[model samples]
Target chain A: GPGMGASQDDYALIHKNILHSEDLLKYILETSVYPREHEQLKGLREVTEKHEWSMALVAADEGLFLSMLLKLMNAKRTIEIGVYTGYSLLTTALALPEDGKITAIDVNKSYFEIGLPFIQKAGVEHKINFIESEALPVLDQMLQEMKEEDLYDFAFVDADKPNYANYHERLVKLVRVGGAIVYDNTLWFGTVAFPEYPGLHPEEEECRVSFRNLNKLLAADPRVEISQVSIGDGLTICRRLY
Target chain B: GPGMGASQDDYALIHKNILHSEDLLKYILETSVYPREHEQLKGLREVTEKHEWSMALVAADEGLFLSMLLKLMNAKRTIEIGVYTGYSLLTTALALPEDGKITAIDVNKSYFEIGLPFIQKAGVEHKINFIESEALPVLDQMLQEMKEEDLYDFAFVDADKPNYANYHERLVKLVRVGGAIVYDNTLWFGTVAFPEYPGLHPEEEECRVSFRNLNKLLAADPRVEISQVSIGDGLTICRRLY
Candidate 1:
């Protein structure tokens, strides 16, 4: 499972689909608040649906939320820490202007390459500078050239959980005072709040601990104003205040 | 029970405090996101809490969200359709700069006057033009003088529900293309999607129908991008797009 965390059933439970019906969620998508370019992103979604770790894909609702936020901020330069199949990236790509740039970093290209054609099909490939490398060194490199405090308008972290705090420290410095940094899976399917640890696979357990610690750290961080929204495994939106 | 909708217990259920505990919700507020001027706004919240229509006051989480959004957009000129004791108005006032202006419209001064002293004490009375009149006529007057498509940077519609569609129509034109209009209680206590009409109070039933209709209209409107978040009885955030 490449970047697998939660099951599809888990997503449904968290969202609390009205009347315990999937149709309501479908109705929500059909009736309101889907992107005009949503059809173009379908191919990528379908491809990701077949992946063993398909659950890693950002939910359609969360994708819609991000797209709306970027447009609201008029965000131009953004950073995507995780580029699993480029679903979220495409949402960002569609929201930004033609001249906008996304510095998308991924540990490897195998996952990203699966959706590259779709990105090309959507005509937003030019907007993405897909760097197949670790995110840490790249952020550090940007810091070396960081003359201005606000280099990026937005940053989305959905990659490795262990590095989330590390990502936040750099992201706060990179994003403008009023700009935003969105850290995905802050709730970890509501496990972050649980008192007793339910045992899981060794790797999953590690991730659980890291995510819980990071959530606590984020809550106390004074530099950013945060809203821990329970949307799609929970998204903690941190807006840089200083 | 003036302007009564959901009970305090009902609001608690809707938010789903983790472990069925109020402590979790309180933890979220205390640990993650809280407004800087929270102490300044306490007097207003306390006053509103004692009002007959106390439940109508916007929750702490929703107010925090609005304050952050205003700062993120650098919103100055804004409109608040509902001013139930001015809980939300104070939130906006605190978030904006010294010269920021809020055109607050409420049908009568009786309710607003309850929260006026706190707004005065907060030193934001000068920032507000407390127009004691119906929102419709005021919006119509603005339309008559409409020279620009985007006169307002932000607009919050939390007033009467039957008029939500009407308010949105005028708000879309008044708000800048990139600016946002937040429609509160679009979920109507999560009853919007119910197939059979859940038995609600006569007034609640009427509000349910209106909010549901407005939600559908907002979803289909191509002029704005929307995110129907399930927070504080559901908030529909509409970002006007040209």
Candidate 2:
């Protein structure tokens, strides 16, 4: 992993807000989030800032929201689909009780390895069970294996966008009826609402379309109640109602 | 209550985002929130839109988030500091269990009466106890009256920005140790982050400074953990930790 200039586009893109003014994000992070951020979580962010595609890392404010939500739920058993640089993973581990556990999956072990040290330093590594594999196959295997009593209390997804619907179909059954499923990047950089034009980059266009469809699908799905929070990219929090 | 033209600045100001783009809020509300909004909420919003200072109504997306949060916590007994058109009050009343109760206070009774029909239509009127007065006096009175077992499970504050710090001081004692307190408009139309300027209106400036002071005060206080979410001007969620 190599460092980029603090002035680079990566840093700008990483901190991009789905909010009205960029300064609003700054206000929240500086005034509320940064003041209370855990030591190792900050350490991991500093290291991950040097890694490639640092924009893929979760926003600091979102991590704070997730941590608070988990604790509010007293969530003990949880799952995370994408563990890039492990920023959010570490945040989750710290939020849970000492006996709580999280089963985390990511296709790239290298990215997870980069933040593994910070996770260890935080002394919550025992709370995380990192799986080095694409999440769907692993989710399928786990669903096949879980007993009648085995169901996650919560789940966080920041992985492949197109597969979110598939993941949701599986998650609803694998997680308990009252468990929470939080999906990140639901607005796809706010382009999902933008006019479809060829001027957009292919990658951005595909992500935009995927999230547009996903939002409608999630809204139409009656199994869970959803809140589309415009916090980092966008967070769609669904509470299962069955 | 009198109606204003849709072209007025009030609608635009009411829907203002602390978000990156206005379309982001539009997308979330149009896609996820409106489709799921209860019929009575729609009716209340319609009538409330005709009222003066319609800008005071809570954003639909924030209502969705609060509803989901209430269900996730299974919040039974709740309190709301503001009852503007009773939008959030109605949202909370609907979110709680059938037997749940809310102690809601507002300085003006007229605005809440405008929304009372919707609440009655929704069949959740039994869940609400509306008090017409300044909230501080009521909160103080409640504090003096409650037994050791009388504690609120949740609180939603959206009135009197300058009094937020004072509200927190009393609320920390009125609400239970593990309960949640959600404050609305913590961003003050994103002006809290803006550089102080002589040109800003006195009303806006006072609000900006008050929230700035309140945000920092909340962050420094350790009685609760906070998440200053950028949804609906800004939502600061605190879960008490004794």
Candidate 3:
């Protein structure tokens, strides 16, 4: 007999309806703090959600952990790779002590230009040095330029997923002991369990493969203590204790 | 047209092709993280997602936050209204200095029993007193019996929705001038929004109204400076600066 026809779309409908009460918290969470004036940020978050470009950009979910790390470490120096529109950068700048600074790197100068006004308007631009350039080579040079012991107190990684392992390799060295590195979009929209054998879309297959491999690498790496938070798209915080 | 075979199942032919993205990161995320043991937490989370439960169990997120809140105020005594499975209890207990204590109240004996093993295993159960009873009246007595100088560093509310207002009112007195109270699940699974309500379901509806009123009450009260956190299920941390 031919098999019964079934689809993810069909399963999705049922799965949503029967979803557990706790799991739904991730979706139900409204990542807005400036409730009254959150329209623009909320709109952008909606765009990200719709386009599947990224998850919500609220400071509380994934951003909360980063802030906590900064506060705990009394981190005077920080770095952010991929400062798209400065959402995370704004939160990082706000979390720092009066004299703290963040070096934000990204290649999209025009886009960063649009969001720079908001960060400046919020009055934290002085603390942020937005460098418009490809992140990897810059990080490479930045790591080489400074002694391994003289790296960042905190770091946030939210760039192209293909380069996550590359980012982690350099970031592991560029962050101080007892400091943290938060890798965003580590879950990739619930697709973290789709396949091991390479599928059709080469980039998607490669991205998924790498995400799994990196998670394994991190789990086994004795150098850092790790905690995976199930916030927007999942946030994995690696604390380098060594 | 109705006579022309209008049917309940009438629909356009739909087909689903599982788009396999060869993206390495995407594929790996799909495979590894989803199958881990903690994925049960993900399923539990799914339940929250489907039911749209904005209830946050902070114990699951950061033991550090709870610990910090306690140590910051030098809180030697405290109370927690809803002790679900005691994750937060274990954290609070661990954070407390040797003589510090937490009186945790909850109605579910079995649920608290589930957490007893872990709490005992951690060896901090000595500092925590778990009571199997409803919160309001017990708290009333605790407040009355305690001296004015006997201040609580923190209290977290995560129990029956209808009793939340009662919890807030009672807890305020129990916490000291320099202490704080964290009210969990303030967002109520996004149902707090007027037009976005979950439904007329009694529990959800009660939570909806309770949260609506609580936001106002907390805002109007001048005793504390409120810094709401949208972590877990919308946590509202009221820092008593009086």
Q: After superposing candidate 1 on the true structure, give the runs of residues whose Cα lies further than 4 Å from its correct spot.
A: A1-27, A33-37, A197-205, B1-24, B34-37
Ranking by TM-score: 2, 1, 3
Q: Candidate 3 at A37: error in angstroms?
A: 5.3
All candidates: DockQ: 0.40, 0.76, 0.07
lDDT of 1 by residue, B141-179 (tens): 999886774388999999988899989889988988788
How would you encode candidate 2's per-residue C-alpha lDDT over A1-242 as one tens digit per residue?
45534333523234445676777777788999999999999999999888767778889999999998898777899999999999999999999999999999999999999999999999999999999999999999988899757799999999987789889989988888888999999987777776673444445566778888889998999898889998888889998877
- Fnat for each model: 0.34, 0.83, 0.04
Candidate 2 per-residue C-alpha lDDT over B1-242 given as tens digits, one digit per residue, 9 for 90 to 100: 56654433523234445766667677778999999999999999988888767778899999999998888877899999989899999999989889999999999999889999999999999999989999999999998899768899899999988889999999999989889999999988877887674445556677778999999998998899999998887889999988
Order of candidate numbers by lDDT, starting with the best: 2, 1, 3
lDDT of each: 0.78, 0.87, 0.62
Position A221, candidate 1: lDDT: 81
After superposition, candidate 2 runs with Cα above 4 Å error: A1-16, A195-198, B1-16
Between candidates 1 and 2, the one scoring higher on DockQ is 2
TM-score of each: 0.88, 0.94, 0.64
lDDT of 3 by residue, A1-242 (tens): 47764323322211221112433333334322333223444443444444322332433344544554455346788989887666677767877877888989988876566566666666677898888899999998987689866678888998777898889888888898867788886655545655554332465566667777777776667776565544545557777767
Q: If chain B of candidate 3 is superposed on the true chain B, what is its TM-score?
A: 0.73
Instruction: Let me know the TM-score candidate 2 reaches against the reference structure.
Output: 0.94
